[PDB]
Design an enzyme around this catalytic site. Structure first.
Site, short mmCIF file in Angstrom:
data_model
loop_
_atom_site.label_atom_id
_atom_site.label_comp_id
_atom_site.label_asym_id
_atom_site.label_seq_id
_atom_site.Cartn_x
_atom_site.Cartn_y
_atom_site.Cartn_z
N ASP A 174 1.18 -8.03 -3.31
CA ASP A 174 0.43 -8.55 -2.18
C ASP A 174 -1.01 -8.82 -2.59
OD1 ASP A 174 -0.09 -9.50 0.40
OD2 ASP A 174 -0.12 -7.51 1.32
N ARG A 178 -7.81 -10.49 0.91
CA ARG A 178 -7.89 -9.40 1.87
C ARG A 178 -7.63 -8.04 1.23
NH1 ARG A 178 -3.55 -12.60 2.61
NH2 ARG A 178 -1.58 -11.67 1.89
N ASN A 179 -7.00 -8.02 0.06
CA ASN A 179 -6.73 -6.79 -0.69
C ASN A 179 -7.65 -6.62 -1.89
OD1 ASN A 179 -4.67 -5.62 0.89
ND2 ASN A 179 -3.15 -7.06 0.05
N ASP A 192 -4.39 -1.92 -1.91
CA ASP A 192 -3.47 -2.32 -0.84
C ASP A 192 -4.08 -1.80 0.46
OD1 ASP A 192 -1.50 -2.74 1.08
OD2 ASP A 192 0.15 -2.14 -0.21
#
Length: 329
Positions: A174, A178-179, A192
């Site tokens: 992921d 945003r991470n 995460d």
């Protein structure tokens, strides 16, 4: 559905490490009395991340600002188990300058707390949105004193953090802006941050099968074949670079994710060059988006490519900060 870190560690190839069978090293145990919890940093469907102050967690920093991951008080026992598993994964991986590092945990009695590094500037998306309109200067890149060199610095540090994860046979699954958090000194820290999100009601995550996936960031083989590898992380890294050099744009803007989208990407459609990307940076993105995974560059090679796009003095500045991190306890 429950919260679970998305990272997965490869045990062997012909097989993923079952985090439940890893040991929890009690050396991380920190008294709950030494934590003072503060305001929320992000609150999701299953729990939240909050600022805190930790007393005596570090011998060199006896009063330290930290971040604290925790579940809602209604959490089922299976949910607590997943937070234990995240704790064990971080212990197994060990530390690196460019990941959000584990600092300690409260597991003995009551709710499980994961204590991690605190990142002053927050996530890269919000940082880019805050500084979009503004878009010893070279020496001030890695300090608290936006330019193309800032974007290249973020680009380089994510490659180094990802090179570290790959060296531990860890697949992120992921990777996205945003991470990626930004700590004091403009140090990039991959994480995460899913505990702060509700993927069932988040336009970045799309219902596919029985769950919600970051499809706009996923390589074709992950979408169609459920195959996740370090090379699929490289594809996501290329999408992340599009986020960076669009100063926080959403990938494939104005396109809806559906069956048409999957086949369009599969057929070879790629995003055009973002406005503030150089030709060299766009060529990196294009390489990362190869249909054939083995044609994608490794994160080690990506670090080498990007370092050569940065001023020579930047590399010395980075390794001084990295040296300080390794010597600090």
């Amino acid at each position: 559905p429950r919260y679970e870190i998305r990272w997965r560690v490869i045990e062997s190839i012909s097989i993923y490490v079952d985090p439940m069978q890893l040991p929890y090293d009690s050396r991380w145990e920190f008294p709950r009395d030494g934590l003072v919890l503060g305001r929320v940093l992000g609150s999701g469907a299953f729990g939240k991340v909050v600022e805190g102050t930790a007393y005596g967690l570090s011998r060199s920093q006896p009063v330290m600002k930290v971040a604290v991951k925790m579940l809602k008080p209604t959490a089922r026992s299976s949910e607590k188990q997943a937070l234990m598993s995240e704790l064990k994964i971080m212990t197994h991986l060990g530390p690196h300058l460019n990941i959000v590092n584990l600092l300690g945990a409260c597991t003995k009695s009551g709710p499980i707390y994961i204590i991690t590094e605190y990142c002053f500037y927050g996530d890269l998306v919000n940082y880019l949105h805050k500084n979009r309109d503004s878009f010893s200067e070279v020496k001030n890149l890695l300090s608290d004193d936006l330019t193309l060199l800032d974007l290249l610095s973020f680009t380089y540090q994510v490659a180094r953090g990802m090179e570290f994860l790959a060296s531990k046979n860890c697949v992120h699954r992921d990777l996205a802006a945003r991470n990626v958090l930004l700590a004091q000194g403009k140090i990039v820290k991959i994480c995460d941050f899913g505990l702060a999100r509700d993927i069932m009601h988040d336009s970045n995550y799309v219902s596919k099968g029985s769950t919600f996936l970051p499809v706009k960031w996923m390589a074709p083989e992950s979408i169609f074949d459920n195959l996740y590898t370090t090379l699929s992380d490289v594809w996501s890294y290329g999408i992340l670079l599009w986020e960076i050099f669009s100063l926080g744009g959403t990938p494939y803007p104005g396109m809806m994710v559906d069956s048409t989208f999957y086949n369009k990407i599969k057929s070879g459609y790629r995003m055009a060059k973002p406005d503030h990307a150089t030709s060299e940076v766009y060529e990196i993105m294009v390489k990362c988006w190869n249909s054939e995974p083995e044609k994608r560059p490794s994160f080690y090679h990506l670090s080498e490519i990007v370092e050569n796009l940065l001023p020579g003095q930047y590399k010395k500045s980075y390794e001084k900060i990295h040296l300080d991190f390794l010597k600090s306890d």
